[PDB]
Amino acid sequence: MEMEKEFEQIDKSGSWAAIYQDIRHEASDFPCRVAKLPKNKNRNRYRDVSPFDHSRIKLHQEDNDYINASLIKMEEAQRSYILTQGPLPNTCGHFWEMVWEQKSRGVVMLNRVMEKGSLKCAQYWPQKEEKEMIFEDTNLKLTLISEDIKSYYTVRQLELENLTTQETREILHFHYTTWPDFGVPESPASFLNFLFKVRESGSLSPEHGPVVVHCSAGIGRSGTFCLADTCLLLMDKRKDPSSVDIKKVLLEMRKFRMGLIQTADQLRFSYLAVIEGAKFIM
Ligand SMILES: CCc1oc2cc(S(=O)(=O)Nc3ccc(S(N)(=O)=O)cc3)ccc2c1C(=O)c1cc(Br)c(O)c(Br)c1
Ligand SMILES: [Mg+2]
DSSP: OHHHHHHHHHHHHTOHHHHHHHHHHHSOOOOOHHHHSGGGGGGOSOTTOOOOTTTEEEOSSSSOOEEEEEEEEETTTTEEEEEEOOOOTTTHHHHHHHHHHHTBSEEEEOSOSEETTEEOSOOOSOSSTTSOEEETTTTEEEEEEEEEEOSSEEEEEEEEEETTTTEEEEEEEEEEOOOOSSSOOSOSHHHHHHHHHHHHTTTTSTTSBOEEEESSSSSHHHHHHHHHHHHHHHHHHSSOGGGOOHHHHHHHHTTTSTTSSOSHHHHHHHHHHHHHHHHHHO
16 A cells, blocks of 8 residues: 555654654745734634634624634545634633534544643533533523443534524534543554544535534644545545545645644654555455
8 A cells, every 4th residue: 555655664764753844844824814913812722823814714703703713625525624722711602603603513522621631622512411501602502412432432412502593403522532641542543433433423524514623722633633534535536546645635734724733743643544544444
C-alpha cells in the first residue's frame, strides 16, 4: 500500500518532524479579523487559534454573529465538517445555536472536560435526564435523552429544542473519552472504530448539516478525525486509491482552519489511522 511504504520510509529516516514542519510552512494564511475584534475577546479560548474570516460560521443573530468555528468543505470527498473550540462558560448558548442553525445531526467531542488536571471546555450538555439545560441567551432547551457508555467512547442522544418555535431535533453526541493526556493512541483501532460509529449514525451524511467537531482548541484531535475520514472516503471513490496523498488532503483542509494536526506525532498517527482503516476495508 503506497502510503504505507511512505510511512515506513519516514519512520526509517526519522523525518516526521521535518515532514510536519514542511506542512506548517506551506499551510495557508488567511485573515481572522472578526476573531480579533476586541469585542470577541471573551468568545475565544486560545489567542493563537482563530477561524479565518472566509470560512467562519456566522450565528444567525443580529449584532455579533461571531463564534470560533470554521466550515471545512471538502469538495471532492463531498463531506463538510464544522471544526470549533470546546465551548466556554459564556459560549454554550452560541454553540447550540450554531448546531441548530447549521442543521447538524451530530456533535463529535474528542476531549474530556478535564485533562491533565485542567478544564478543557465547559460542561455544555446535561449529565442527567431530569436536569435539562436552558440557554437563555439563545433561547434553546437541551435534554439528555439517553447515554451509552462504552469502552473507548460514550454516545448520547440529546433533544435540542428551539424555544421560540418549540421545534425539536435529535442530536447525537459522540464523545471519544480515551485520547491520552500525552502523545497519541498506540493503535488507531479504537479511534477508527469510533469514526465508523459516527459514520453509521448518519451524522456525517449529506442529508444533514455538517457534523460539529471539537476538542479543546478544535484543531489537533479534530483535524485528525476529519483528515482520516476524508482520506478513507477518497480511497473508496477514486479509480486510483493509491493517488490519495494525506499531506495534500491536510493542506487542502488547512485552507479552511489553521493548525489542523498540532504535532508530528499527530501527523504520524493520522497516516496510521488511514493505513489501518484501508487495511480493514480492506
Ligand atoms: C474501517 C473502520 C475500522 O478500521 C479498523 C482498524 C482496526 S486495526 O487498527 O486494529 N487494524 C486492522 C484490524 C483488523 C484487520 S482485518 N479484520 O481485515 O484482518 C485489518 C486491520 C480495528 C478496527 C477498525 C474499524 C472498525 O472498528 C469498524 C467499525 C465499524 Br461500525 C465499521 O462499519 C467498519 Br467497516 C469498521
Ligand atoms: Mg439517573
